[PDB]
A paper describes a structure:
In this work, we investigated the first crystal structures of the apo–MPND and the MPND–DNA complex from Mus musculus at the atomic resolution.
After extensive crystallization trials and optimizations, we successfully obtained MPND (residues 2–160) crystals suitable for diffraction experiments. The final apo–MPND structure in the space group P212121 was refined to 2.06 Å resolution, with an Rwork of 23.0% and an Rfree of 24.9%. In the final structural model, the asymmetric unit contained two protein protomers, each with three helices (α1–α3), two long antiparallel β-strands (β1–β2), and four short β-strands (β3–β6). Each protomer included MPND residues 62–156 with missing residues (131–133). According to the SDS-PAGE of crystals, the key reason the N-terminal structure could not be resolved was due to the conformational flexibility during crystallization rather than due to protein degradation. The two protomers possessed virtually identical spatial arrangements, as revealed by structural superposition, with an overall root-mean-square deviation (RMSD) of 1.0 Å for all Cα atoms. The main structural differences between the two protein protomers were in the irregular loops, particularly in the N-terminal location. Two MPND molecules were present in the asymmetric unit of the apo–MPND structure, but their interaction was weak. Interestingly, the structural analysis suggested two possible dimer configurations: dimer 1, which possessed an interface area of 439 Å2; and dimer 2, which was generated from the symmetry and possessed an interface area of 411 Å2. Therefore, the oligomeric state of apo–MPND in the solution is mainly monomeric.
Numbering used by the authors: 62 to 130, 134 to 156
The structure:
Amino acid sequence: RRAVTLRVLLKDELLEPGEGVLSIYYLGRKFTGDLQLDGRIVWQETGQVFNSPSAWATHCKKLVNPAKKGWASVKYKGQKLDKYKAAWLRRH
């Protein structure tokens, strides 16, 4: 499951790269991300580059709730990334 990265999903065209195609909603705050062809995420607000959905999600949620502490929270065009991981496995 961990093996199935954004890089892998992009290569087999489960996902397309693009600006503002990734989103997180957490306790009232919306976060928007650009998906690069290399599978890295650009947080639009600061331009900070993250290596994984989990890395971006943990950073964004800690700003809202420092107690908190990826694939379930991060959405690609309104669908959870977990749905694309599962879809890759079912496609092989």
